[PDB]
Design a protein around this ligand. Structure first.
Ligand SMILES: Nc1ncnc2c1ncn2[C@@H]1O[C@H](COP(=O)(O)OP(=O)(O)O)[C@@H](O)[C@H]1O
Ligand SMILES: Nc1ncnc2c1ncn2[C@@H]1O[C@H](COP(=O)(O)OP(=O)(O)O)[C@@H](O)[C@H]1O
Ligand SMILES: Nc1ncnc2c1ncn2[C@@H]1O[C@H](COP(=O)(O)OP(=O)(O)O)[C@@H](O)[C@H]1O
Ligand SMILES: Nc1ncnc2c1ncn2[C@@H]1O[C@H](COP(=O)(O)OP(=O)(O)O)[C@@H](O)[C@H]1O
Ligand SMILES: [Zn+2]
Lengths: 437, 72, 99, 429, 434, 443
């Protein structure tokens, strides 16, 4: 089955129709003000009429900021593209640090495109090139045989170059498209498999239906994928496109002229109405790790009119800005960007609310825990941390499977908590032996 | 009209139809010329470096070329 | 490496096809229908791989000029480029194309 | 109803820069309110660039954070007018591993300047009634327009171009007499009867064959890339080009100078714009001086929000985050903060731009929020307030809903106050 | 006398964790001795990995230098089994000038997870009787012989191209795949190759096969997610795997690979198995890789990982503030800490006794007193090196039993780090950059 | 002849039969403890029982630990490989430090494989298409075999080959008298060139003339080729065959050191294990040497832990001339000898001490006899006083100019006036350092 994930049990924000936050819903408890605050945010993203908005999440580590981000990601649905990003990902040797942040917007915004394609496919009965004086091939003559009928068509020397590229021979089934110009080969027909007792080529049955068929194909592509396709000529029918296809795909920066041309052609597609554009959501975790230069570019980036909504996550308080060497700023974010972003306050969980999280996670892991072990795990959790009691669930279940008990017991929790060490106790032990370290 | 290569366990055989031409022709090296070529002025003689059209005789060097051109 | 068949077998890596050393030895079970695991250095398994493909593909840009000679250079550049260079890329050499 | 690529931003609520023939700014014009002296100076700079008789001059914009000088800069860019070179860059964008900082800044100075060249070419366009081809190959076609009807004969190359792209009866196309590329614009309504049915275009009018003058503006960086790389379109669009030799650039400068001496073409100075220049390296800070001292240089404007701050790379504290060498090279225009009376006007025009209906108590309390806190925070409050009003189903925003949004989102100062209480639990306080 | 590529090593003698079915630690088993707490915890993580129902978990091991923190990881590594994938990486290995550290981390996480795929193919194996080819498309026949049955098959165009490309002649035992199309020549027959042409080529000989000619075989393989991502990212990049030139793979391709692998798991043709990622001396890793590791571990495909920390209360590289174990509180609190108790005097004698059976060196009873005292005053590693060199000098004296005088000889030849520091203090003024 | 090298006078350790180190052996005097310790180290290398062993050499500059480490390879011989590497080579722009150390670990170990070769070579006297008589109605003509003649100075031989090779002989240019290479095992046929005998007929010809091979027609010889695991890793890293367009273009590209994945290392270990199981290939371990170890980065110091804990790690020796110093990469961290305590605990430290004035005089005499220079008694005493005053190295450097100037003056031997004039002209490092203090204000 599916591997259990830490955030897998979170199905969303768990909000009612009035916008208020229920006590326990969608696998989330507490943070009523945060969830109720996000209830307007999901209505903004679903409204789509506003852009260039950034919402910062401020809270202690382990308070579910990332759970709120992924909860919004699950609340908006699968149609709304959601792009996670970490502050350490923007550093790359191939491209500049700014190009990553600029490409994350095109990768955030999604686009739905409907493409009408005309298809010519079937068995090839005869293929011959024409000969014209300059010994050059001006035209190609290829007949097509199908169960419905036979029709002879003429092809261009480029399509013939793709056929000879695919090693197409008489008696094989091929796939030909017009607008794209690419040529595919399905394989040899099954009727000829009897002449050879042993053959390397696999056989496919003869397809059915008319040779020429026009069909609509709805595909979802991202403006970053379009931006890379227009950036480098990886695909194509050109021999240089084949050589570049053999070359290594290193990352390169995209010019603002190409970006503006993309805005032009996509704007024309919107004016035609064939393409449907949907806004994306860009998530940034560990924003305090981002450089002051990345924030400097984020000034113009967030002020951009086409920028999708960006959510930030800050788990730290006042800290020195990266690269400044002197000035320290609240939440690791300088006052310039911090003035623009919208801050959401997150509060620590209460001792009563922690036990419910321990119970929900214990049920998610598939473990049966008695009320005594639940109260003990809650007690030690409030003594140290929630993450510790969350991590103590599985090993105690393992000891239960070893001893044969159907449920966890106070001796199992006591033995597991005896084996594992808390960060506070370990940090206290490091003081006595610190001289030996 | 198609050439047939038949390789068995006892030996290998390459058979050709009467329609196709014979690809094979017996080739043996001819007898080499015993005497080497020699220079024009015969106190010199060495294998000839070049031929001279005006004197119509082969010479190794311009030194002997002066004697040959003077004699002609 | 070509003079020695063993030293040639010492280098399995080839840019043309995939290679894997998964099966070191062969274990055969003799019956009316025999099953024997593979061995040595030869493994490919191309079928399952490569299913992933890019979503969109773009055609390289072209220049448009107001004279005829630039259309000549454009048709030569786009179609064959150089003849001996085109055949030299397809067959790897012109004498490999005639060959 | 369809969502365009552009959406309402901070600078998008204003269109153009309101001015007068006497250069006296109105209180509210072209969406902008206040900053009479700032709009007057920016208007003087705009008239200078529109004159374009000089080159290599710099002017700096200074002001407190939240004064909207970036908004007056983008509004000046909108009021600049079409068909004029403009470039917008940031101080942090010039840093790249692919290209050097000097080649990137110089590349920006190249993209800013541009050249306008006018030509004339003979292009045929119209509806094609019939096409006949006989296979050399000889064929004739009929080109019909509303005014006149003509018949033409094709050569070998024209027959090849016709057989390349098949054209049916009565199709409006454009045939170029120079390159030979045939492009089909559309299909006639009556002739297209009896297919894909992609588009329909009416029969053209006027003369069939006309000589058109093409006005085409090219960029110096564009020409430099085209000449340096084998294919400059693949170099520029691919982004692989970098570290272009300066000798080729100098030769191109001399050739453009020869073009201006011939007078067949003209050069149009561009407008460079730099954002967040408070933090920048002294290499670029020093290179701007010589780049402006060059013969042909575009007119640039730079924005610096911060005040006196230590520059990057040195331990010296420069005034306005810029060294005195660059400060003395340009003129500075300072902007004053917005008045309380102008705050509610900005809020109202943002209600008109964002289509939000609020009350006078809403404008009053939000004006108090503009007095105690920056206006940007209020502009961020109303946007989330409209949605809460929609959830309340009311046709007008209420102060209670504004209190709900104000309870949902907190100011940076408030988050700092709570972060002072929880700061010990936070990491690396 | 034959020496393999593997040689005796510090952690190489451990054959496993030495655990019972109850998972309770045994004092001496599978080459490991002592430290019942960390042995039991290692049993918990081994049983957890063998369960494989939970993903995205991190286990940390801390203790004093010389407590066997690496010996435990090698114990679970050897006790995990060959069929389960295991990967051991170091913090300095993921640092590279070609690719980014975070990309190397993604290669580690996707590298630890193994994928097992089974393949059933019908192949033909027999001795060639005759080979005939007709060239005008070339059409020829192939006659094969086996002890059970003699067969005759017809060859196609691609088949003749493959055989002629492989230089196959009559009298060779070959293996042909119908579906794949590959041909591999195993060798030649003794009797069929006894009479050969005057060329006289001597290479190899293989006996004639028996049974059915065409048989069905099952060959199972394992492929890494990083391997598939490199192959499909480089567009026929099979050489880039061994070349290592690939880097900075796009994330969209990785996402599509994850979705396609999930679809394969839904189909059941391919199976996914968990794997272990061992990291030693993680305290020197940059804090950026920690911030990326905390959020990157939340993925469903993120395997469980195990880290080790030698020291504690030390500032992180790139930051001026000290943190416990050189790790931020987010990660340190994000994973569980397992402390290792320092070894005692009683266990040292048994550890030194393991080298007697491992290295096949007979040790006298009087050598364990002085050698054990050297193990108490100095490092157990220096005690093991003293055992090795003591056995070398023992062979130099040609004795079967170890003598104390030889151990005194080695102790006179090699000095402890503290002693080298003591002499380095006397000669330190003459030394450079004192 | 061979240019004299500073260490060229060290021919080995010069150990005795009982294991004790002779006082003066192989041009090495003193350092009995170090010579005996290295005497056990070479026994570990020859024994090959352990791997990943790291030895450390510490001491003042000029104590001869480099001469002992280089003497180890001379005592072991040319059978086992020896790879000296300075720590400065670890830092590189293209290749990462860990890949450098790994490629060194693969450079130390090496292999030897014995192989037999059978080759036919000589001038071609005749080529005949031998036709057996088997007329058939299906196909008219039949050719059983092709006879290829070969002529050499030792003897002539004819060969009967299958007609399939005649298709290649007709595919490529073959003329009478062409010296060709034909291998029986591979079966391929290559054309070497035209014979030198026919070069006299034409004054100018495009074909080059290779001489006829001297030897038997059929040459079968067994040669043992030694290939290191690093060479195997490079050959497995990039394809040697240029038949592919990507291999040709990549061959045109500039070669750069590439990071090799661990999978290729594992495959090499597996195939090497197979050939060792077959016994055809002989595996010998290498000896890795490292000088200026204090110059390594802390990342390299921590990487050497995981590198040494592996069983494939060859024996590594270290040389450190520095005392307690700050660890490179960390400002406030100080460790003895310039190495962290973690690796310093794993390595085996060997102490070295400075020579006495008598040993200085003896080493000076050894270098004098090595360079072929004669020294008078009193001048040797004064030179020993100079070396004792400053250093042994400077007193060694003073030998050459006194020899050259002595030959110029006409005296075949060095004199106290010669070493006095040389010592007057040249300045020792400490004296120059003291002179720099007075004029330091002007500098
Ligand atoms: N309100 C909540 N209800 C249920 N589970 C929660 C809640 N908040 C946090 N969690 C769980 O706690 C775990 C750790 O949270 P974490 O991501 O560390 O929070 P933060 O991102 O604020 O540091 C998450 O896997 C999440 O599922
Ligand atoms: N003339 C104006 N009229 C109305 N609103 C303005 C005007 N100038 C600026 N603003 C407001 O200021 C905001 C942007 O301010 P910004 O340019 O970031 O200030 P600063 O340049 O000081 O950082 C916009 O949201 C806009 O609504
Ligand atoms: N449980 C154990 N059983 C046997 N030997 C051990 C054990 N733990 C440690 N050792 C020995 O101690 C030596 C040094 O261990 P070391 O690697 O320093 O431990 P750590 O990694 O915890 O510092 C190793 O050579 C190993 O053989
Ligand atoms: N015991 C010795 N006998 C003869 N020559 C020596 C001896 N020790 C050192 N030397 C000479 O001194 C020179 C420099 O030695 P060096 O490499 O500096 O030693 P170390 O590495 O111990 O500092 C060498 O060329 C060597 O010939
Ligand atoms: Zn002559």
């Amino acid at each position: 089955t599916q591997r259990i994930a830490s955030h897998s049990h979170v199905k969303g924000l768990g909000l009612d129709e009035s916008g208020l936050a229920k006590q326990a819903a969608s696998g989330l408890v507490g943070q009523e003000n945060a969830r109720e605050a996000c209830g307007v945010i999901v209505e903004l993203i679903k409204s789509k009429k506003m852009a260039g908005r950034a919402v910062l999440l401020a809270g202690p580590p382990g308070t579910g900021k990332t759970a709120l981000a992924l909860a919004i990601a699950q609340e908006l649905g699968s149609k709304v593209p959601f792009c996670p990003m970490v502050g350490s990902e923007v550093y790359s040797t191939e491209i500049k640090k700014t190009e990553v942040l600029m490409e994350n917007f095109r990768r955030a915004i999604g686009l739905r495109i409907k493409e009408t394609k005309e298809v010519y496919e079937g068995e090839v009965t005869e293929l011959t090139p024409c000969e014209t004086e300059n010994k050059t091939i001006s035209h190609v003559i290829i007949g097509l045989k199908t169960a419905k009928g036979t029709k002879q068509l003429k092809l261009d020397p480029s399509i013939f170059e793709s056929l000879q590229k695919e090693r197409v021979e008489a008696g094989d089934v091929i796939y030909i498209e017009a607008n794209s110009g690419a040529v595919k080969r399905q394989g040899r027909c099954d009727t000829y498999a009897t002449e050879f007792d042993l053959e390397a080529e696999e056989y496919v049955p003869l397809p059915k239906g008319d040779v020429h068929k026009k069909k609509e194909i709805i595909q979802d592509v991202t403006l970053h994928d379009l931006d890379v396709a227009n950036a480098r000529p990886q695909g194509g029918q050109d021999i240089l496109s084949m050589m570049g296809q053999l070359m290594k795909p290193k990352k390169t920066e995209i010019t603002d002229k190409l970006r503006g041309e993309i805005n032009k052609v996509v704007n024309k597609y919107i004016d035609q109405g064939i393409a449907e554009l949907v806004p994306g959501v860009l998530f940034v975790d560990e924003v305090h790790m981002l450089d002051i230069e990345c924030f400097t570019y984020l000034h113009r980036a967030l002020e951009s009119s086409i920028a999708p909504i960006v959510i930030f996550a800050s788990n730290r308080g006042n800290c020195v800005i990266r690269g400044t060497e002197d000035i320290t700023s609240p939440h690791g974010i300088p006052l310039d960007l911090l003035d623009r972003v919208m801050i959401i306050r997150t509060m620590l969980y209460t001792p009563q609310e922690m036990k419910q999280i321990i119970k929900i996670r214990a049920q998610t892991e598939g473990i049966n825990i008695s009320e005594e072990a639940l109260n003990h795990l809650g007690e030690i959790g409030t003594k140290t941390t929630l993450r510790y009691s969350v991590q103590l669930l599985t090993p105690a279940n393992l000891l239960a499977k070893i001893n044969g008990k159907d449920s966890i017991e106070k001796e199992h929790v006591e033995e597991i908590s005896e084996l594992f060490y808390d960060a506070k106790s370990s940090a206290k032990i490091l003081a006595d032996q610190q001289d030996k370290y | 009209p198609m050439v047939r290569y038949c390789s068995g366990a006892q030996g290998s055989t390459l058979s050709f139809p009467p329609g196709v031409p014979a690809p094979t022709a017996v080739s043996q090296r001819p007898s080499p010329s015993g005497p080497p070529p020699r220079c024009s002025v015969p106190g010199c003689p060495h294998p000839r470096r070049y031929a001279c059209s005006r004197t119509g005789q082969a010479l190794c060097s311009l030194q002997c070329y002066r004697i040959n051109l003077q004699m002609r | 490496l070509c003079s020695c068949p063993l030293l040639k077998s010492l280098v399995f890596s080839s840019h043309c096809k995939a290679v894997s050393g998964y099966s070191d030895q062969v274990v055969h079970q003799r019956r009316s229908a025999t099953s024997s695991l593979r061995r040595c250095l030869l493994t490919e398994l191309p079928s399952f791989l490569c299913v992933a493909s890019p979503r969109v593909t773009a055609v390289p840009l072209d220049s448009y000029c107001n004279d005829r000679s630039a259309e000549y250079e454009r048709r030569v550049l786009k179609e064959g480029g150089s003849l001996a260079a085109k055949q030299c890329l397809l067959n790897g050499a012109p004498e490999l194309a005639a060959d | 109803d369809v969502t365009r690529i552009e959406r309402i931003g901070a600078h998008s609520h204003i269109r153009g820069l309101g001015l007068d023939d006497a250069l006296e700014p109105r209180q509210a014009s072209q969406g902008m309110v206040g900053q009479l002296a700032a709009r007057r100076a920016a208007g003087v700079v705009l008239e200078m660039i529109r004159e374009g008789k000089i080159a290599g001059r710099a002017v700096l914009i200074a002001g407190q954070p939240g004064t909207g000088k970036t908004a007056i800069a983008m509004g000046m860019a909108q009021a600049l007018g079409p068909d004029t070179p403009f470039t917008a860059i940031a101080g942090s964008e010039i840093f790249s591993l692919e290209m050097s900082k000097t080649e990137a800044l110089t590349q920006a100075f190249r993209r800013s300047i541009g050249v306008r060249i006018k030509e004339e070419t003979e292009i045929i366009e119209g509806e094609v009634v019939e096409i006949q081809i006989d296979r050399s190959k000889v064929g004739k076609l009929t080109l019909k327009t509303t005014e006149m009807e003509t018949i033409y004969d094709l050569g070998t190359k024209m027959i090849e171009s016709l057989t390349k792209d098949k054209v049916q009866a009565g199709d409006v196309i454009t045939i170029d007499k120079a390159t030979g590329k045939i492009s089909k614009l559309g299909r006639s309504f009556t002739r297209a009867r009896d297919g894909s049915q992609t588009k329909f275009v009416q029969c053209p009018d006027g003369e069939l064959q006309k000589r058109k003058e093409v006005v085409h503006t090219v960029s110096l960086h564009e020409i430099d890339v085209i000449n340096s790389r084998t294919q400059g379109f693949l170099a520029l669009f691919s982004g692989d080009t970098g570290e272009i030799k300066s000798e080729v650039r100098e030769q191109i400068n001399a050739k453009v100078a020869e073009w201006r001496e011939e007078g067949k073409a003209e050069i149009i100075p561009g407008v460079l714009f730099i954002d967040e220049v408070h933090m920048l390296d002294i290499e670029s800070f020093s290179f701007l001086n010589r780049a402006l001292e060059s013969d042909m240089a575009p007119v640039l404007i730079m924005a610096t929000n911060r005040g006196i701050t230590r520059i990057r790379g040195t331990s010296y504290q420069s005034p306005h985050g810029i060294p005195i060498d660059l400060l003395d090279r340009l003129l500075i225009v300072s902007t004053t903060p917005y008045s309380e009376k102008d705050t509610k006007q900005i809020l109202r025009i943002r209600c008109e731009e964002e289509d939000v209906e609020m009350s006078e108590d809403a404008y009053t309390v939000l004006t108090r929020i503009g007095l105690e806190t920056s206006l940007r925070y209020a502009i961020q409050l109303i946007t989330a307030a409209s949605l809460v009003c929609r959830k309340r189903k009311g046709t007008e925003v209420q102060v209670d809903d504004i209190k709900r949004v104000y309870s949902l989102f907190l100011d940076e100062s408030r988050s700092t106050q709570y972060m002072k209480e929880y700061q010990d639990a936070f990491l690396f306080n």
